[PDB]
Write a protein that binds this ligand. Structure first.
Ligand SMILES: CC1(C)S[C@@H]2CS[C@@H](CS)N2[C@H]1C(=O)O
Ligand SMILES: CC1(C)S[C@@H]2CS[C@@H](CS)N2[C@H]1C(=O)O
Ligand SMILES: CC1(C)S[C@@H]2CS[C@@H](CS)N2[C@H]1C(=O)O
Ligand SMILES: CC1(C)S[C@@H]2CS[C@@H](CS)N2[C@H]1C(=O)O
Ligand SMILES: [Zn+2]
Ligand SMILES: [Zn+2]
Ligand SMILES: [Zn+2]
Ligand SMILES: [Zn+2]
Ligand SMILES: [Zn+2]
Ligand SMILES: [Zn+2]
Ligand SMILES: [Zn+2]
Ligand SMILES: [Zn+2]
Lengths: 267, 267, 267, 267
């Protein structure tokens, strides 16, 4: 009868998710500056920098190191954008805001989850909390944000979280435009899909999101987990060689989703 | 050169801090309903219940079980008060608000720390975060809150946190009034005391707080860590026999503090 | 050259919007307790009361008076729900939370607008601000909330605000079920509809919302502005005689919307 | 019996409070850029600008115009500091944050009042609300903030609001240092001073605040209402000629306060 309540369990991840890497250039202004298996995109403009995702909470100083290596001081970081506000992508946002000039733009769903530090998650409860942060600007579906002339467009793709967002922008490479699509996760890891009281239209939202991702302007696809789009950040000059199209990414995710639905019904 | 960033570390505590106990009566309306080494006080009135502190985050269901055993349903819990908003005392507040009718009253300092889930701590950084919660009412020093005729008075005693508070109220036992003082921690565990840029008047605040605690109306002293006031919750009918006076508690804390100052100067 | 900046202008409304009325019964548990031209619905259950909308900020005490007349004390009010978080419907929510046991449930969009006190409105800027309030529970589209056995279902109908919601529930009258639909505004008063940078999919959302409202379970329709559904709260026993169906309400709103689009294109 | 609830009343002020003025230089880096009777101080450094107070809500564009005239673009504004978070000093803060790079630093008391948009004021209720804004950094008493080498020190002086703050910094004029003290209001306009349930130690805090203001480093005193320190912003080259010392300002305020106490006791 002498059994204490369990200790808090820390959110632990594969080592490669926490393996620092030097900046890897994607296009003329766009760099991967996160870890080998977590995306954090730096977009550098004549009028300041944008960060899309930060990865895990303990990655803040690494990101700042890579920004510095790129010529970006804490004051130069103007804007943080997010794919979705889980601990492994928005983890260091609170600390980055404290240590830089960065302000956060996000949709309402991502803002309230971020402001909760990821607590009371629809699926994971309080299992994956991180330092809470406030959004400085609330964006609507299809809204644009422009920094130093690079134009970022929000495309809501609710499912993995209610606030899951794809961000698209046009960069250059070899004098030619490169339409980059940073599409969010389309996974539903351990989720109850059917009849979920916390997310009654979950399935309809995922289906709509597959269609949204399929139709993005998308010369180059990147995802918060690089493996999801067949990126290999450790592969240097061939890091993006095997990358999926947005269409292939959406199709793969939908096939997996359909399998999961069938297993849920059986399980 | 292949070294990943460290995993997040969970806030782990002595087993006794997480050891559930049945409700232990302190006075006619006042019960200890937390664990063997973390205080959570239930005050039951004809017009609803008050909880002072909740302990650790994983204690929410245990607290609700003990409330139920006391005749208090989730709807009957009206108010949560806090000693200070660290993870081991305010841990389950967010979840309790979700699962009960309880609203939170706290001073501004405790409210902003609670709303941060204990992140960006003046001394511990992000090492001890917990689910964030919002305060429903902001209280000033000396302000009273009355529930079912039990009158709670706030006495600010800044130091351990900027928002550290003692709560006092008068209960009964054997037809006679019992002035209960729930005084906050007066410890400064691993704190930089002198010349702390995040807390420049830390020492002056602690000194003022020793004086405040010394003068509280105090037939019976209780503390968030029971050992600090020489309570032994596991000792049944003699649980409070060895309890310190508020004067002795303050004197002991000040002596320890003075020792720590001298060691800091030497160290 | 001696011209000061203009004085702040107060949000002023037709007198009838501020004309108090006694409670008007809609069904066995459902009462209109607002003013002659602003809806505030009280639903009374064996397990506490629900308020849907509060009207204008200065209506808080009137609402509390009408609740008292109905047998509902401040402690009995459990839940506040909202159509949308503009000043003339969510106005007194902050004060009601301070003065009652009520907690607020709303979607993310309505929560962030409520938390801003209606400032930085997509269309009205800071022209219609009110006291800010926090949401205690975030609801998803189609999610249910149950109080004393009355089941409330959320139906998002974005347009008038991003967070505009219809609430439906089943009450009784004469032993027979009455499916009540409290549908939000479908107006777009002075809005820029086409190419709005703050709301790029505004038109698509309104169209979807007309379809949503048309299909609601709807024996009885009520709207935040009673005139919108042809209610006349001052008409006593015939107050709801001329009420529109949800289908007629949606059709009328869509026709008006189409006219407004055509005028915008011309204007 | 046909009497509607009263219309909302706008917070209206003397015309001179809203009368724009060109920037007026105080010292080498410090400018008054508000209106003739509301202070808004711009401090310009090689590493960005600081704004102390903004005045009324409708002053945002005027402030931005004056900043531009000074060579300060929206991106150059790094920090907003506040005397206290009433509508006539923090009014345009939300809008300035939206339109500039500025982040807000304030103590906990001022932060929670700012976050409420000045609603539920201890003395004025909801009579003087303004757009709410979030603080980006919480400061403690005596804490310093450094921008481009100008060092700002916070001195809490609770009373007029719980979060009332004096800010001090050292600028230059004619090669000599000029210790500037921006001391908050010490007025208590229509306040209940004795036995105020919302502010039980009000009198003790004011007394402490008179002593704090008296002892500030103070070659030049400025106040949120210039008349309080005998500044005349419209008087050009003699604008500050008649300015009070911090000692004289504190003495005058204490004398007035004592008179008010005596009248309250009589009244
Ligand atoms: C560990 C988890 C079950 S909890 C966390 C939330 S969703 C995904 C990270 S994107 N992650 C899940 C996962 O990676 O399976
Ligand atoms: C583990 C800690 C260093 S961090 C945490 C904050 S203060 C105290 C809990 S009251 N606690 C310290 C302690 O118990 O030493
Ligand atoms: C006065 C307004 C232009 S501003 C306010 C926001 S939408 C509507 C109240 S539902 N109301 C508009 C209106 O009633 O026309
Ligand atoms: C108009 C008021 C009664 S309400 C507002 C809050 S304190 C002062 C502005 S500093 N002001 C008071 C005043 O100026 O008398
Ligand atoms: Zn995720
Ligand atoms: Zn992830
Ligand atoms: Zn502690
Ligand atoms: Zn502790
Ligand atoms: Zn409206
Ligand atoms: Zn309306
Ligand atoms: Zn004031
Ligand atoms: Zn003022």
């Amino acid at each position: 009868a002498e059994v204490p309540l369990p200790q808090l369990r820390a959110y632990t991840v594969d080592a490669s998710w926490l393996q620092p890497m030097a900046p890897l250039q994607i296009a003329d202004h766009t760099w991967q500056i996160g870890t080998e298996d977590l995306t954090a995109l730096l977009v550098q403009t004549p009028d300041g920098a944008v960060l899309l995702d930060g990865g895990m909470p303990q990655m803040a100083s690494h990101l700042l190191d890579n920004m510095k290596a790129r010529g970006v001081t804490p004051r130069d970081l103007r804007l943080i954008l997010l794919s979705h506000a889980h601990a492994d992508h928005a983890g260091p946002v609170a600390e980055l805001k404290r240590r830089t000039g960065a302000k956060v733009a996000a949709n309402a769903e991502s803002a309230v989850l971020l402001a909760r530090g990821g607590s009371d998650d629809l699926h994971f409860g309080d299992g994956i909390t991180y330092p809470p942060a406030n959004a400085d600007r609330i964006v609507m579906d299809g809204e644009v944000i422009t920094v130093g002339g690079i134009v970022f467009t929000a495309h809501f793709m609710a499912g993995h979280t209610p606030g899951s967002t794809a961000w698209t922008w046009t960069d250059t490479r070899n004098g030619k435009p490169v339409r980059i699509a940073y599409a969010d996760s389309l996974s539903a890891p351990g989720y109850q899909l059917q009849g979920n009281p916390r997310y009654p239209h979950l399935i309809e939202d995922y289906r709509r999101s597959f269609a949204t991702v399929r139709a993005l302007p998308c010369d180059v696809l990147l995802t918060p987990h690089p493996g999801a789009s067949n990126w290999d950040y450790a592969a240097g000059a061939r890091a993006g060689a095997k990358a999926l199209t947005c269409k292939a990414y959406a199709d793969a995710a939908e096939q997996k989703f359909d399998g999961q639905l069938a297993k849920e019904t059986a399980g």
